[PDB]
């Protein structure tokens, strides 16, 4: 479908994951358990 085609565009057009995700806060490890 346009998922296979969506997966292909992700490979060729990488996003700035380090910024788009590596910047967002995350729960502390203590909180998790």
């Amino acid at each position: 479908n346009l998922l296979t085609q969506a997966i292909r565009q992700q490979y060729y057009k990488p996003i700035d994951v380090d910024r788009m995700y590596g910047t967002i806060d995350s729960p502390k490890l203590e909180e998790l358990f």
Partner: protein, 271 residues
């Protein structure tokens, strides 16, 4: 603000993972497809894998390499812990090996160059993987190896290690013998892996754990006739009884058989 499950559209399940199901999902704001591993807080605690999952997350979340499955972030709710992970479109490497029986030299060498590069990145950070085997590897859009599980991994800044861990056919002699071990256990496992890629079975395969232990500690390596001299040279240089004598990871990447056969391609990077 951090992430919540409402930030994603769950497309479909991808299968069972370690202590949790994995689902293909798309993060809404970016319409970015990723895998979501879902763990139940109560199952974890009741299975005593709390101080185990933390280490796996603690290590995997800080590794950024094309051949290491990326953990983008993670979040939790009342009952679940969600890991936002890189989606590896081609799935399980072990399934591909099982389907083909054995890989040809090109495929094996490419995987070996990728593996060595990723393990070198880990070692430069004092991370020892300790459980390299086909089942812990996934494959990217273009078939690139992705180390995807870090269950036995350890950040070992100084002191040697004593824990026996890993998988039977992949254990280095030093673990079987109860000695301390260091990052060189990954060099041994890489040699077992190259052999299994090319042959379809690990080198010390035996009916009992005692006979396999025996074959490993005597490095009872018997090369099938169809292997090239180059692949045997590389395997023989990794599967050395003495850890100090094993070929370094940089050596695997520069080995002639790897250079002559690898068709490794680096994924496009952002910019």
């Amino acid at each position: 603000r951090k992430f919540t499950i409402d930030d994603f559209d769950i497309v479909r399940p991808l299968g069972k993972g370690k202590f949790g199901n994995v689902y293909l999902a798309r993060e809404k704001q970016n319409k970015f497809i990723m895998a979501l591993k879902v763990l139940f807080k109560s199952q974890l605690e009741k299975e005593g894998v709390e101080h185990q999952l933390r280490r796996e997350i603690e290590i995997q979340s800080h590794l950024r390499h094309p051949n290491i499955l990326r953990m983008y972030n993670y979040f939790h709710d009342r009952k679940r812990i969600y890991l936002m992970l890189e989606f590896a479109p081609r799935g399980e490497l072990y399934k591909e090996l099982q389907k083909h029986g054995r890989f040809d030299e090109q495929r094996s060498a490419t995987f070996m160059e990728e593996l060595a590069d990723a393990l070198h990145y880990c070692h430069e950070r004092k991370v020892i993987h300790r459980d390299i085997k086909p089942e812990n590897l996934l494959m990217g859009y273009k078939g690139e190896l992705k180390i995807a599980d870090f269950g036995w991994s350890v950040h070992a800044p100084s002191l040697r290690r004593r824990t026996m861990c890993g998988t039977l056919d992949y254990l280095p002699p030093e673990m079987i013998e109860g000695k301390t071990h260091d990052e060189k256990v990954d060099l041994w496992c890489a040699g077992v892996l190259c052999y299994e890629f090319l042959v379809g079975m690990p080198p010390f395969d035996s009916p009992s754990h005692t006979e396999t232990h025996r074959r490993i500690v005597n490095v009872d390596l018997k090369f099938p006739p169809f292997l090239s001299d180059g692949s045997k040279d590389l395997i023989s240089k990794l599967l050395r009884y003495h850890p100090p004598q094993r070929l370094p990871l940089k050596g695997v990447m520069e080995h002639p058989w790897v250079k002559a056969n690898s068709r490794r391609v680096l994924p496009p990077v952002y910019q």
